[PDB]
Each structure stands twice: as C-alpha cells, then as structure tokens.
C-alpha cells in the first residue's frame, strides 16, 4: 500500500 | 422460519422467545426486526417478546427496545410490563446503560407512565454525566410532545440545563428550548455570552440549530446596523461566527449566511456570498436549496453575486429545475455591463435540447429586455428570428414574448404582425393563436387590409377554437366592427350568434356585453357612444417582476421560503426594535 506515494 | 404459514412461524417464534436458548432468542428477534423493517404486523408477538426485556444479553436488549418502540403505543397495557426493567436500569452505574434506558423509557408512548417519565427527567438532569444530560434534553422534548401540560416543569428543567458549561450538552438543550418553549427568551439572556463563545466548540448539528435560534433573538436585542455604533455583544455574535463560514457542513454554512443576511451590516455581509458560491460545488440536492437562497438574495443585493457571474452558467447535465434556478439568478444579475455576454449565452441556451429550459430562456430574454431598454431592438430581432424555427413550442413561446415587447414598445412593427398573420396558419398552441389575434386587433388600423381576411378564417374555425381564442375573436370582431362595420358587421353578427349558443357562459357573458356595447340598440346611450374609446383604450406596459420579491417576509434558509408557504411551526422574524432593550439583562 506504501507503493506509489511520494515520500514526505 | 421457512417456506410455511406465517401464523405457524410466529408461533414458532413464540417458542423461541419462551425457549431458554439465547441464540434462539436472537434468531427470533432478528426475524422480528426484519418484519418491523418490512412494515409487517408483528404486534401479535408483543406479549411474547416483552418477556425478554429483562434479558442479560445486551444484544437482545437492543433488539427488544426496537420492538417496543414500534408497538408499545398500540399495546399500551402489555407495555406496562417493561417499566420496572427501565426503572432499575436507570439506577445502574453504567451511564451508557442509564442513557439507553432513559431514551427507551421516554420513547414509550403510554399516557399512564407520564408521572414516571417526569420523575426520570428530573433525575436525569441531576445525573452528573454530560452524556446522560444530553439524552435528558431529548427526553424533555419527548415528554412535551406527549404531554404539553407538563411544559412549566419542563421549562424549569431546561432552565437548569442551560447553565451547563459542557458543549456536549448545550447543543441538545438549545434544541429542546426551541421545541418546548421557543418564546422564553428570558431564560437565555444570561447564557448568550457563553453560547457565543462556545458555539465553535459545539458539534456541527447543534451549531446549526443554535444559530437559527441566535438570529431570532438577535432581532429583538439589537437594532439594525444599516452614528450607529456596534454593541460589543452584537459584535461578539458576529465576530465569533466569522470562522464558521469555512465549515465543511453546508447547513452550518447556510446558517452562518442566514445570520449575516438578517443581522450583519449590509456593508460587511457581502463576504458570505463567496462561501455561498462554494456551496454550489457540493451535492446537487444541496445546490438546489442553495440556488433558491441565492436567487432570493440576488433580487435585492445583486452586487453580492456580480463577480461570480460565470459560475451560474447552466450545464447541459443539470436537471431542468436546476437549469431554471440558475437562469433566474442570471436574470437578476443581468446589466448593461454584461448583457452582451449573457445574450450570446442565452442565444445558445435557446437552442438547447431541453425545450422546457429553452422556453424559459426565451421568457428570460424578454424579461431582461424590459430591464435593459438599450438592447431591446436586438432582443426583438433575435426573438423574431426564432419565429422561423420549426418547433411549435419555441415559436409559440416567442410569440407571447414578442407580444409583451410590443406592449412595452408599441412602435411601428406592423411587419411583425404581417409575419404573425402568416404564422397563425401553422400555430397550434391556443395561447399563441389568441395572442396573435390580439396583436392584430391592437393594431388593426395599421393592418386594415389583412385583419378582415383573418377574421373570416377564424369565424369559420370559431367553434373548434379554444375558448380563450374565441374571446379574442370576439374582441377582434368588436374592434373590426366599430372601425369597419360596413365590411365586417355580417361576420360580427355571425360571431355573436356563435357566442350566443356557446356552452361556455363566460363567453356568452362577454358576448352579450359586447353586443350590447357595440351594436346600436334601443338604449344606445352615452356609454355605448364611448365603445370606441373603450376598445381603443391605450393599455399600460406589463411588469415582469421576479417571484422572489414575494419571499421577503420569510426567513432566508427556512423551509418556508423554499416552499413559499408559511410551513407548520414556522416562526416569523421580529422587526428591528426602535431602541435596544436594557443591555444589562444580557450581563
């Protein structure tokens, strides 16, 4: 689920 | 339960209710609730169900409560059996349970237990848990609806509850106030200050209710701000509500808008329209209501919607009723600084697949034409071009609007009438048919070579025409008679003879009236000598005013203006006091 999100 | 007789199955349910197995009881109750949800008559199970009201299985307890709510009003005697369970539950250390008991108890619509419920309410106010107190507020409301005579005591209880600093309680308490004793403002004065300060800390639904109440009293404590200095308390009210405007709850936003619309200084209140626009970004059901409010406002404060004009453009996906509301808003916002844009857009709108909308659009164009005289020549030209459109509704509607334009501007437009005379052959819609005839009559002296031909055509069709048309035939004929009896009196007589036997007595009444008036007779006196003045009297131009002008007395945001009806329970707003009431009462 963590895939696809921009690290912030 | 299975594929069998319902009666037998209900008896099996009774067995389950009597059975010592909890799962049997659960099964039965779930089946029973299902029947309740389906609107089935499970009342025959009442004496069997009630026995499990004392069950220790909390899941069952909830199911039982549902059942009791649904049928206790009918089986009032049987319902009495559940009373002690509730009474004991009300003494339980678990306040969730106490509250639940309180609610259920109050929901039992049996007159016998009123004394009981009363006592329970009083104790509930003394519960000390805010959770229960919230429920107590609802209990008050409930009892009131079941027994109005207890109002005095209920008021005393509310008065007590109003002193509660908890924001989890006050909301419901205010609601109860409105439900029970909305006129007892003397109970609130002292509480205004914290109501204002704590409003932002109140749960969204409570906030809505509170604000409506606040506006209603504000109009008695304060005097219209629109030198006038602002009362610190007035200022408090407004400055505290300010931030609420950005709430996610549309109802809250509307409530805020209401406040400023009816209370805030007219030079300041303009800001709320910005938010009112963002409400149009939400669900359509909301938008419908919002648009009604916008339109209501726009009829007075056009400048509040002005800068957002394009946002009111109609999309083809909009429902007809939505398209209509937006159209009205645009109408009110039309002016000489933007009419050229609007007309282009309107021209497009006229060609919409939604003929109902297009018809309304045509009417709107006519309305804005009367509003802006400067563009009426072009309005007319476009409108006239629509007469060539193959669609019957489109043309018929434009005919009517043209008529209105000619009433506004009775200039030399005989060429339009000439065209209308030809159109009449194809016009089906009676209203337009009559309208054409009327225009012919109004300017028959400008088209005297055409009118008599139209006349005899209509005379032949008279019996098949609409009664409205027939009346125009009569009036037309009367004018033609008075000005040219030497060529038309025969046909006039025929028409009079037709009216003479027509079943619609209204026509006959008009017929005898006219006949006596225009036809020379035994008593042809002074008034008959003025028949030509009567029929050739110059008529005044029509006033195409917007319908929202009739909603000025309704409070903006209430059901009543969305209906345009003084809806049940609607309270009317007070007028601004000449002077403000003694301020220290609010201290």
């Amino acid at each position: 689920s963590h895939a696809g999100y921009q690290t912030i | 339960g299975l594929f069998s007789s319902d009666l037998k199955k209900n008896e099996d349910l009774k067995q389950m209710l009597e059975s010592n197995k909890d799962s049997a009881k659960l099964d039965a109750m779930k089946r029973i609730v299902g029947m309740i949800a389906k609107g089935k008559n499970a009342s025959e199970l009442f004496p069997a169900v009630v026995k499990n009201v004392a069950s220790k299985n909390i899941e069952i307890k909830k199911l039982v409560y549902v059942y009791l709510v649904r049928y206790a009003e009918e089986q009032q005697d049987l319902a009495l059996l559940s009373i002690s369970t509730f009474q004991r539950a009300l003494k339980d250390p678990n306040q969730l349970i106490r509250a639940s008991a309180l609610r259920v108890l109050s929901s039992i619509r049996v007159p016998i237990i009123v004394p009981i419920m009363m006592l329970a309410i009083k104790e509930a106010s003394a519960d000390l848990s805010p959770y229960v107190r919230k429920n107590a507020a609802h209990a008050i409301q409930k009892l009131y609806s079941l027994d109005p005579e207890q109002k005095e005591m209920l008021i005393e209880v509310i008065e007590k509850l109003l002193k509660d600093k908890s924001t989890l309680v006050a909301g419901s308490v205010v609601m109860a106030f409105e439900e029970v004793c909305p006129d007892r403002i003397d109970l609130i004065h002292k509480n205004y200050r914290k109501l204002c300060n704590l409003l932002v800390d109140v749960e969204e639904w409570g906030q809505v209710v509170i604000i409506h109440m606040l506006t209603r009293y504000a109009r008695t404590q304060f005097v219209s701000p629109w030198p006038y200095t602002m009362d610190p308390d007035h200022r408090l009210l407004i400055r505290n509500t300010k931030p609420l405007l950005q709430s996610r709850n549309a109802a809250v936003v509307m409530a805020v808008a209401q406040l400023y619309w009816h209370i805030s200084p007219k030079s300041e209140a303009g800001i709320i329209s910005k938010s009112l626009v963002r409400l149009l970004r939400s669900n359509r059901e909301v938008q419908y209501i919002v648009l009604q409010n916008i339109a209501t406002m726009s009829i007075q404060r056009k400048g509040m919607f002005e800068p957002y004009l394009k946002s009111f453009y109609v999309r083809s996906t909009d429902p007809t009723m939505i398209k209509t509301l937006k159209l009205e808003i645009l109408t009110n916002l039309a002016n000489e600084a933007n009419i050229s844009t609007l007309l282009r857009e309107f021209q497009t709108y006229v060609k919409s697949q939604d003929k109902q909308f297009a018809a309304a659009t045509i009417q709107t164009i006519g309305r804005c034409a009367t509003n802006i005289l400067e563009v009426t020549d072009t309005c007319l030209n476009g409108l006239v071009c629509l007469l060539s459109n193959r669609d019957e509704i489109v043309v018929a509607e434009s005919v009517v609007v043209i008529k209105k334009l000619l009433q506004m501007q009775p200039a030399q437009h005989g060429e339009i009438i000439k065209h209308m005379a030809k159109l009449l052959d194809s016009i089906t819609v009676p209203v337009a048919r009559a309208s054409i005839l009327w225009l012919i009559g109004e300017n028959c002296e400008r088209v005297p070579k055409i009118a008599p031909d139209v006349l005899r055509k209509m005379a032949k069709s008279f019996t098949s025409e609409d009664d409205l048309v027939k009346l125009q035939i009569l009036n037309l004929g009367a004018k033609l008679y008075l000005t040219n009896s030497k060529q038309t009196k025969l046909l006039t007589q025929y028409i009079l003879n037709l009216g003479k036997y027509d079943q619609n007595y209204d026509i006959r009444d008009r017929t005898r009236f006219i006949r006596q008036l225009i036809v020379p007779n035994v008593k042809s006196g002074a008034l008959s000598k003025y028949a030509k003045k009567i029929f050739l009297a110059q008529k005044p131009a029509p006033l195409l005013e917007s319908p929202f002008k009739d909603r000025d007395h309704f409070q903006l945001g209430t059901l009543s203006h969305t209906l345009n009806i003084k809806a049940t329970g609607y309270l009317e707003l007070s007028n601004w006091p000449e002077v403000a009431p003694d301020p220290s009462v609010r201290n």
């Binding site: - | 609610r103 805010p130 609802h138 809505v208 931030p243 429902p319 809806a567």
Partner: protein, 418 residues
C-alpha cells in the same frame, strides 16, 4: 425533527421502513411517486415536496431515494446533510449504500439508524464513535460472535465521546505507524464550440488515511499556500493557527478521513490538458449524417492522460451510428441515444479518434445544436494547480511513521460545446 424514513428504490418499491415519532402511512410515498412520474428524470425530482400533512425531504443517490417525513418546519439543509451523512455511513459499513446491502444487513442497518437518529434529532453522528458503538460486520467477527456469544454492540461509551477530541477514538495503537495523504484536484471547465475557454476553476480536496498510534499532533504546511483560497476545514483543524501561522495543526481521527477542500483562484489561467476537434453533420430530414471527434493533449504538463471517457447525449433524430474507434471502445445506445466512447489513454505517436457516419431518422429534421461533450480523464503524479506541500510534522508521539502523499488531477465538471 424527522418523523420517519422510507428507503425507496428507483423501481418505485419501498425496502426500509423506519419510524421515530409515530407511524407514518406508506401512502405518503404516493406523493413522491406522483412527482417521480411527473419528472422526466430522477435527477429532476424536487427534493422538497409538500403534501397535505407532511413535508417530504429527499435525496436521490445511487439508485436510491432517501425520503424523510417531517411534519414541522426544519431547515432543509439540516435535513439534507443529515440524510446524506447516513448514506455515507452505510458506505462506511457496507462499502456503499445499495438496496442489496440493505436487504442483506437489515438488522444491522436498522440498528445503525436507531443509534444515529434519536426521536428525529441527531445522536450518533461521528464515524469513529459509531464504529465503536456498533462494530462493523466483519465476517471474522461474526464467527467469533457465534463461538463466544460476543455482541456487536458495545457496553462502554467510547472515551473519545467525552473528550475534547470527539472526532476520534482513544487508546488506539498500530505497529505499522503510517499516514497517507491524497491531493485530488478536479478541473471544472466550459469550453465553447471554437475551443475557447469559457469558464474554468480548480476544485481541490485533500484526504488522508491515518494509522498512527496514540494521539499525534499533525502539522501540515504548503510551499505555496498563497494559491489556496476559500478553503474548507474539518472541525478538527485549529483554524486559528491556520490564520496566524498558515499551518494546519490538528490531531486527526483514525482511518479514512477528509481534511480540507479548496479552490484555486480564477486569477490564474486554468490549464486545460485536453482539446477536442469535432464535426457532426446533420442534413435536415436525411437518413444519415457524419460524426468526427478527435481527442488530444494540450496542457498535459508532460504527463500521461489516462482513463479517458467521452459521453454524448444525442437527439431523437439519431437512430444508430457507424463509427470506428482508433482505440478503446465505441458503443451506442439507440434506446436513450447515448454515445459512449472509451478512449483510454493518449499516446503522442497517434492521437485517438472516433469517426464514421450517423444513422439518422429519415424525414426527421436536423437538430439546432450538437450535444455537448462530457469528458472524463485522469493524470497521476500531477496537481494541476501546482500546489505543493512543504512539511508534515508530528508532535506528542515518539515513533517515526511512514509518511506518504500523492498528487493527482481528474476531470471535474468538464464539458465542451459543439
């Protein structure tokens, strides 16, 4: 406020009957049915209908009508938001408000309604509290219930109910501490026949999924907050700090959560990622005409435009269509005259189009306008407004959670004239 509630399917059937103040006759629904019949579409059914003794407030949603019955004056939006919220709750517990979901979970939804509405007044309204009052119908839980006899109804008022942070639960922990942010923008645009921009604005909304242990105090800030205006705020947000610091400080609720919404000012020209070339020929009274549409990229910011769908409502003169798509899928409904073209995504090597002839009704006249175009599309990894988040900070907790955010722009109310 509310006396009763009827759940009505668009079919005209009643599925869920509720009564709070008294029993309302089902015959009251005939006034709705009449109005439904008078309207040419469920979308055009008046949300407010007056009957001799009752006021009907209703919401159309997902093929269902939520028809409430009220006998006294109640602010329409109060009711509408409430009912709408109920439907949202059903989506939370059963994936979506559907008649199937209702008939399969009758007891549960019946119970939910009893908790949410108390004698016509709002009671259980906050999701996270309600989630604890009544456990969601997890099949695993139902197994446990049949084994242990456990209830779905709690017996302890959730502590958060009496806290100063009512929008969330207390004592909730995660081993996988994480928080997801989703910046979604929608382009609202009106394009005329010439392809000129008539009207446009950007509608944005930021959602989030919070799986952070305890009571973390989040602080969200932007690199360019000046582009935000007319921003809505969920009550959990410390508005004052938004005003004085321009910082979104708050302790968020658990799980699925909408934080804010905003508008991008018209002062900045809204980039339009898609252009449309078009031509539809209608010879009056002809047995056929011509259809030609081309979809292409415009201000796509170097990103891929995907999930593209074109919907057109044709006039009664149209009987059928002879069209050949370059990709995706051409279909046409001759019953309702609806043209639907699944475009898919745009590859610059060849732009997508749909072209051929139109089968028209011979003897029927040509339409005065061509139907407007409703076009859907999505661009991932792109906030068309250029909105960019500066920082996401957390206070009060000690762990270092996964922090992630997405930026995506989708078609909003995007319609083209022709």
């Amino acid at each position: 406020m509310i006396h009763s509630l009827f759940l009505i399917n668009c079919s005209g059937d009643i599925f869920l009957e509720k009564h709070w103040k008294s029993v309302v006759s089902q015959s009251v629904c005939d006034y709705f049915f009449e109005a439904q019949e008078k309207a040419a579409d469920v979308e055009n059914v008046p949300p407010v209908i007056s009957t001799p003794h009752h006021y009907l407030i209703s919401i159309y949603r997902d093929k269902l009508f939520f028809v409430s019955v009220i006998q006294t004056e109640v602010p329409p939006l109060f009711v509408i938001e409430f009912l709408h919220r109920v439907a949202d709750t059903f989506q939370d517990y059963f994936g979506e408000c559907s008649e199937a979901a209702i008939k399969d979970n009758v007891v549960i939804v019946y119970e939910l309604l009893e908790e949410m509405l108390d004698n016509g007044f709002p009671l259980a309204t906050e999701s996270n509290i309600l989630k604890e009052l009544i456990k969601p119908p997890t099949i695993l839980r139902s197994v446990v219930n049949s084994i242990t006899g456990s209830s779905n109804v709690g017996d302890t008022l959730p502590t958060g109910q009496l806290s100063n942070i009512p929008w969330r639960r207390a004592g909730v922990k995660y081993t996988n501490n994480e928080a997801y942010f989703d910046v979604v923008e929608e382009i609202d645009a009106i394009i005329d026949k010439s392809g000129s921009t008539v009207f446009a604005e950007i509608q944005g909304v930021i959602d989030a999924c919070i799986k952070l242990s305890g009571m973390p105090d989040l602080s969200l800030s932007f690199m360019n907050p000046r582009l935000l205006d007319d921003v809505s705020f969920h009550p959990c947000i410390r508005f004052k700090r938004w005003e004085s610091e321009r910082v979104l400080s708050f302790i968020p609720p658990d799980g699925n959560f909408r934080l804010i919404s905003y508008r991008v000012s018209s002062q900045n020209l809204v980039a339009i990622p898609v252009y449309v070339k078009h031509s539809i020929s209608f010879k009056e009274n002809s047995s056929c005409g011509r259809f030609d549409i081309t979809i292409g990229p415009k201000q796509n910011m170097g990103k891929t435009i995907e999930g593209i769908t074109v919907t057109v409502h044709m006039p009664k003169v149209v009987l059928n269509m002879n069209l050949t798509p370059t990709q995706g899928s051409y279909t046409f409904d001759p019953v309702t005259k609806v043209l639907t073209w699944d475009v898919g995504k745009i590859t610059p090597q060849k732009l997508p189009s749909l072209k051929g002839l139109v089968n028209l009704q011979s003897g029927a006249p040509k339409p005065e306008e061509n139907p407007s175009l409703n076009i859907q599309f999505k661009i991932q990894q792109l906030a068309i407004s250029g909105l960019k988040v500066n920082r996401l900070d957390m206070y009060g907790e000690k762990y270092k959670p996964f922090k992630g955010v997405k930026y995506v722009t989708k078609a909003g109310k995007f319609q083209v004239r022709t």
